[PDB]
Every structure is written in structure tokens, then in C-alpha cells.
Amino acid sequence: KAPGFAQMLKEGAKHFSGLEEAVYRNIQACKELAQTTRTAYGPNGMNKMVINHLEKLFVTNDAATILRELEVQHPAAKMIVMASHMQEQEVGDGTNFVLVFAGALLELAEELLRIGLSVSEVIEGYEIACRKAHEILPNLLVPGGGATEIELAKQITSYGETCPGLEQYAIKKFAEAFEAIPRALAENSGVKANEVISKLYAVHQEGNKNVGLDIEAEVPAVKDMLEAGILDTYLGKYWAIKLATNAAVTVLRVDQIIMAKP
């Protein structure tokens, strides 16, 4: 009986209407991929009781082993997983950087699309911010513990505030995507994440770079990553920010999943 399903003419696939926000659904598949690995991020990462295909029990916190055992069937999630596989090429770390960062770019993109900003304009902002991040990263081995993620966010947020036009909305959200990584370290350590971001921005406002999250259960304060000896690799952050943005942009460019047959 009419009116049936709207915009459904290709093999009866689940085509979300204009009200159902087909783009919003492919993003939700990627956000769920981050929550499966957002908790395993950092030294206090939570282990996963993985059950192998041979009915074998393994308790681990490695991202590559989680995804290799988790049969990811959604194609929108496979793209981010393919970036993790491409992350393994040219570097052997930063896998969860691709999952956590890309999940924040897509999660924050929904706040822009909901306002009414076009998906093609959101992509131009992330591509501009990725190019801007590669110029700021040499100025920052780089500090870890979420230190670069706040400074790189602070430097990119200022570029978006002075840049007029519509690209500033996606450029600012590109900076807030970096904040998800300190928020992951704080949540996995049992600390109010908003208090970590508030302190990390204050010390960076005073110019105290190289300051990261002090990993401690009973101390939500911060410390210098240089004095403690915590350091990350430059190419690990370079190729992670690059592949994560391409995976997020590649998902945003897609608006409809369609079946086929040879």
C-alpha cells in the first residue's frame, strides 16, 4: 500500500531518506568502530576478551588484533580499517590514532551537516587543516601524552578564527578532533577529561609546550613529557593525520551504499 519506501529502487537496499540522513548512518558505523578501540588507547588501555575464530580465548589490547578478529562488515568502517592497514606501511604504530581521530572528524562533521553546511565544504576544511597541521608539526621526535594534540589544535584553531568564510567551521572542528586523544587517555585513566583539556590549554596559553597528561589515578594534573622522557615519532603523527583525514574525507564523499552483481 502506498506511500511505500522513498528512494528505494536498487535491489531493495536500505536507502535512508532525506529525513533519515544517509550520511549520518555511515558515520555511526565509524563511531562504533572507535568505541571498540577508544578504551584501549594509552598505557592504561583496557584489554579485550577476544574470542578467536577457532574458539580460542585471548585477552589483549592491541588494535590490529582487535580488528583482525572483529569481522568488520560495514564498508564505511572498512575504509578506516584500510587506513589502519596503510598505517602499518611506512610506520608500525599510531593505529588507534587513525580510529580515534577519524571517528572524531566524522562525529564532529555531523554537527556541521546538521547546521546545513555542505559535505563538499566540510571536506575542503579538513584538507586545509591537514595541510596546515603538516606545517605546524615540524615546529613541535615530538612530545606525546596528548601534548601535540592540544598545541596542534591550538595552532589550527587560531588559523580558523582569522580565516574568513565557511571553511572555518570545519577547520575549528578539525582542532577539536585532536582533543579526543587526550580525552581518551584521561577516560582510560579514570580522570574527568574536561579538566585535563582545561589544564593542558592553560599551560599552552602560557607557552609551556611539551606538556602532556600525567598518567596517574589519584592525580589529574599534568607534567612535562620532555622531563619524563615520553616522546612520539614525527612520521607516526604525520602519516596518521594524513591517512585519517583521507579516510574521513573518503567516507564523507560517499552518500549512498548500493549493491551490485557481476
Partner 1 sequence: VILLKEGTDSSQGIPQLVSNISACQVIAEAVRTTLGPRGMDKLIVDGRGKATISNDGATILKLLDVVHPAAKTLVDIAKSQDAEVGDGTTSVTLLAAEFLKQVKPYVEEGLHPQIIIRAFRTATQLAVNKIKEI
Partner 2 sequence: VVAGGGAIEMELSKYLRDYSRTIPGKQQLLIGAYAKALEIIPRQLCDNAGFDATNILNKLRARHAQGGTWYGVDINNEDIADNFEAFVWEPAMVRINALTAASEAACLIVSVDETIKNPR
Partner 3 sequence: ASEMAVAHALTEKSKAMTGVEQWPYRAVAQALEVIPRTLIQNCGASTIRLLTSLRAKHTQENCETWGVNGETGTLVDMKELGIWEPLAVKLQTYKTAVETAVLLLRIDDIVSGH
Ligand X SMILES: Nc1ncnc2c1ncn2[C@@H]1O[C@H](COP(=O)(O)OP(=O)(O)O)[C@@H](O)[C@H]1O
x-marked contacts with ligand X along 129-168 as a string, rule CB under 6 A? ---------------xx-----------------------
Query: Does 202 contact partner 3 by CB under 8 A?
Result: yes
Task: Rule CB under 8 A: say whether 88 interacts with partner 1.
Answer: no
Which of 42, 125, 160, 182 lies at the binding interface for ligand X (CB under 6 A)?
42
Query: Roughly what angle, to the nearest 10 degrees, separates helices 119-136 and 167-178?
Result: 50
Is there a binding annotation on residue 96?
yes
Side-chain-facing half-sphere of 45: CA atoms under 13 Å: 19
Q: Does 95 belong to an annotated binding site?
A: yes
Residue with Cβ nearer ligand X (200 or 230): 230
Measured CA angle at 248 (ends 242, 254), to 5 deg? 135
**Does the footprint of partner 3 cover residue 113 (CB under 8 A)?**
no
Concatenating the DSSP letter of every residue in 116-131 gives T--HHHHHHHHHHHHH
The helix (H) or strand (E) run that includes residue 143 is strand 142-143
Q: Please tell me the distance from the alpha carbon of residue 162 to that of residue 226, in angstroms, as a whole number.
A: 31
- Of positions 130, 186, 232, 243, contacts ligand X by CB under 6 A: 232
In the chain, what's the furthest Cα-to-Cα distance? 71
Binding site for partner 2 (CB under 8 A): 36, 39, 46-55, 59, 66, 69-71, 217-218
Binding site for ligand X (CB under 6 A): 41-43, 63, 93-97, 144-145, 185, 212, 215, 230, 232
